């Protein structure tokens, strides 16, 4: 996960 929008096409929670 990286749940955070600074991780962008990352963003997961």
Not at 4 to 9: D, I, K, L, R, V
Request: aromatic share 8%.
């Amino acid at each position: 996960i990286c749940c955070n929008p600074a991780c962008g096409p990352k963003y997961s929670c």
